[model samples]
Target: PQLKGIVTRLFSQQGYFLQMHPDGTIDGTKDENSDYTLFNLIPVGLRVVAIQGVKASLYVAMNGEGYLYSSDVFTPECKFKESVFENYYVIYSSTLYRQQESGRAWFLGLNKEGQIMKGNRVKKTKPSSHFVPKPIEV
Candidate 1:
């Protein structure tokens, strides 16, 4: 069914699940069986959430030009913010914002090769990975 309420999972249009591994590396993986940790999050440090086992924290930050790195701490590399895009949300580095008035969007994505990147719009139009965060019930 279409998500008429809130999204609870993160997946990409190209069939990839965005995963941040330990040791500060961010990428996408299709091996769903190996990455049960992708759905887990902890809201601590830096006003952002940390992914369990995956050392990358879901913080709205950007240390590069329209890009970010998986950080071990809640630093600049670990800050991220979200803006609503219709029924979904766009995850961006806090400073890089969406067009609030026009409702334009910037996309967070993992390419075919599993590289983490974003663009003016989603490279794949289907399962936009912009929405979904496993709620903080844990």
Candidate 2:
């Protein structure tokens, strides 16, 4: 099995968000959210290079960095695994990452046979259509 997918255009930035603490460490809670802040929206054109079982991994070529990331909802203990492939797109349950807060963060990858891994993990209130996978012409 083989699958080819593209990253959403909404998250096609190449920078991470960060907040600085008063003590100079790192502050994630300028708005009382967390203790540190560092986030990046997914990038467009990112695709998966390999997949193994329920685990799908991606190879991102952007921002002067190259790494792999994977996602799986079948494991009893581990449900998500992310490699250095920061800020890539992910599609699960026929939805994108914007519909729900939890859905915003996901592992995007491909199986060993090159198939897009899909399954149930956690459900959110809304689903996104922007991340829908369309047929590609080579």
Candidate 3:
């Protein structure tokens, strides 16, 4: 994939576990899983265009830039468990988007509160709603 702008690398210092339901309720837990907790860090180089919240989804966008991609959509009864260090973080349901040719996966960091912790450009905000697994993609 072809990454635009300045790419900053990020790694997970801790892990997060979540159980999602179709109804939009999420149960968050903490455990240890090397694979789940591991992640790449990247710096925020663009401004956010929009932040949207639906019944069970949260969407964030940037102006003319597609740096974040992939939807981590979970099934209504999906369950997940992973581990991380004290300061590591992870985004829910969304992945860093990359240009088609870039083979590298982009990862973003989350704070203990499940909020995106980018650079000081923007203040932190909590997710509008907890993720609930759905039976199918909406």
Q: Which number leads on lDDT?
A: 1
What is candidate 2's TM-score against the reference?
0.18
Clashes of each: 8, 13, 27
Candidates' lDDT values, in order?
0.47, 0.25, 0.27
Tell me how far the alpha carbon of residue 110 in candidate 3 is from the true structure, in angstroms, after superposition: 3.6
TM-score of each: 0.55, 0.18, 0.21
> Using lDDT as the measure, what is the rank order of every candidate, best first?
1, 3, 2
lDDT winner between 1 and 2, please give it.
Answer: 1
Residue lDDT tens for model 2, 1-138: 233333211111112212323333321122323322222222222332322211112222111011222223212122222223223333322212222544443333233332222222222222221122221223
* Cand. 3 TM to true fold: 0.21
Cα distance off (Å), candidate 1, residue 24: 2.1
Of 2 and 3, the candidate ahead on TM-score is: 3
lDDT (tens digit, per residue) of candidate 3 on 28-117: 335423222222221232321121123234223221142222223422111112112222332332233323584332223334554443
Candidates 1 and 3, the one with greater TM-score:
1
